[PDB]
Design a binder for this molecule. Structure first.
Ligand SMILES: OCCCn1nnc2c(Br)c(Br)c(Br)c(Br)c21
Ligand SMILES: [Cl-]
Ligand SMILES: [Cl-]
Ligand code: NA
Length: 327
C-alpha cells in the first residue's frame, strides 16, 4: 500500500495509447544514412557508436539494440517519443533499422561527454548546484510524463563540461508508473539502488530515481564516488544502514509491511544514524554548505514517500544561486 505523492494518476488520465507501449508501432527509418565513426560503449542490451549522418553531416550517436524481446524495444521507443522535447532528456533524432537485417537502432544527439570519474574531482560548488539542477529538470520532466527512469547513475548522465550541457540517457530500463503496480526490483546499478529495491519492495515509484539522484549529489559534494559502494546487493544495504541507521531501517520496513530476507540477519549489525557532517574533511569542505546537507538529508531517506520529489528538490534553497543566474 504505497503510491507516488506526485504524478500518481497521470498515465491513468491519458489515452491508453500513451502508455500501452506493446501496441506502439514505430516508424523505422533507414540506417544506411549513418556512417559509424567510433565505438563509445557496450552494455548488455546495446552497443553505442559515434556516427555521422552522411546526408547532412550531423554528428550523432547510434545505439544498436541487441536481441531482446521486441516488447522492451517498443517500451524504450514509446518512452522516448513521449519525452520528446523534454528538458535535458537526450534528444531522439530517429528510430532506424538496418534495411536488410531489420536490426533496430536509436539515433540520438551527440554530447561531448567528460567521463564522470575525471569531472567529479574538479567541480566547484556552483558547478554541482548547476548540474544537479539540470538533472532534476530531466527527472521532473519524465516523472511528470508518468515515467520512472530506474537507472540514474553517472554513466547515464552525459555532461559536456565545456558547453555546460547535460543529458539523461539510456531509457532502456524506464517504465510507466501506474498506482499499485508491482515492479521488478532488478533495476538500477548496485550503487544507485534505493533501499526499497534492496529489500524486495515492488510497489515503488518515481522516488526511486530521487534516491539515485541523492547518491550522485553525495558523491559530488563529498567526493566519494560511488558514495555507497556495496560488494553485492546485500552488502549494498549494509553500507546504507551504516549511515542511515538500523533502527531507522526497521521502522521503514514496519511502516510498509516489508519482509526482510533473513540473510540480512547475519550482516546488518547495529548502527546509529550518522550526522552528514561526518563526511566533511579538508578535501571537500568547500563544497558542503548547510543547504547541501539539508537537501541531501531529504533525498537519502529510507522512506521513499518522504523523499523530496524532483520538483521539491528543485525548489530547495541549495539551488537559489542557480535560479538567480538563469534569470
Ligand atoms: O557512460 C556511457 C558512455 C557511452 N555512451 N553510451 N550511450 C551514450 C549516448 Br546515448 C551518448 Br549521446 C553519448 Br555522448 C555517449 Br558517450 C554514450
Ligand atoms: Cl517492471
Ligand atoms: Cl560510510
Ligand atoms: Na531483499
Amino acid at each position: 500500500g504505497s503510491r507516488a505523492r506526485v504524478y500518481a494518476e497521470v498515465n491513468s488520465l491519458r489515452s491508453r495509447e500513451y502508455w500501452d507501449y506493446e501496441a506502439h508501432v514505430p516508424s523505422w527509418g533507414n540506417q544506411d544514412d549513418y556512417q559509424l565513426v567510433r565505438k563509445l560503449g557496450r552494455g548488455k542490451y546495446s552497443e553505442v557508436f559515434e556516427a555521422i549522418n552522411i546526408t547532412n553531416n550531423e554528428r550523432v550517436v547510434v545505439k544498436i539494440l541487441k536481441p531482446v524481446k521486441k516488447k522492451k524495444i517498443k517500451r524504450e521507443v514509446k518512452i522516448l517519443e513521449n519525452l520528446r522535447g523534454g528538458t535535458n532528456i537526450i534528444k531522439l533524432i530517429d528510430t532506424v533499422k538496418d534495411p536488410v537485417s531489420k536490426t533496430p537502432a536509436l539515433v540520438f544527439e551527440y554530447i561531448n561527454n567528460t567521463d564522470f570519474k575525471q569531472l567529479y574531482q574538479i567541480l566547484t560548488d556552483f558547478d554541482i548546484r548547476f548540474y544537479m539542477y539540470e538533472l532534476l529538470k530531466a527527472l521532473d520532466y519524465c516523472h511528470s510524463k508518468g515515467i520512472m527512469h530506474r537507472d540514474v547513475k553517472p554513466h547515464n548522465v552525459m555532461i559536456d563540461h565545456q558547453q555546460k550541457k547535460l543529458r539523461l540517457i539510456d531509457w532502456g530500463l524506464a517504465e510507466f508508473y501506474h498506482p499499485a503496480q508491482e515492479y521488478n526490483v532488478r533495476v538500477a546499478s548496485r550503487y544507485f539502488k534505493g533501499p526499497e529495491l534492496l529489500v524486495d519492495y515492488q510497489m515503488y515509484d518515481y522516488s526511486l530515481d530521487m534516491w539515485s539522484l541523492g547518491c550522485m549529489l553525495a558523491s559530488m559534494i563529498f567526493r566519494r564516488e560511488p558514495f555507497f559502494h556495496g560488494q553485492d546487493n546485500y552488502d549494498q544495504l549494509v553500507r546504507i544502514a551504516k549511515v542511515l541507521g538500523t533502527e531507522e531501517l526497521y521502522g521503514y520496513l514496519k511502516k510498509y509491511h516489508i519482509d526482510l530476507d533473513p540473510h540480512f540477519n547475519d550482516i546488518l549489525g547495529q548502527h546509529s544514524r550518522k550526522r552528514w557532517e561526518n563526511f566533511i574533511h579538508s578535501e571537500n569542505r568547500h563544497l558542503v554548505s548547510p543547504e547541501a546537507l539539508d537537501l541531501l538529508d531529504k533525498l537519502l531517506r529510507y522512506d521513499h514517500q518522504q523523499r523530496l520529489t524532483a520538483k521539491e528538490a528543485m525548489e530547495h534553497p541549495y539551488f537559489y544561486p542557480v535560479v538567480k543566474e538563469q534569470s
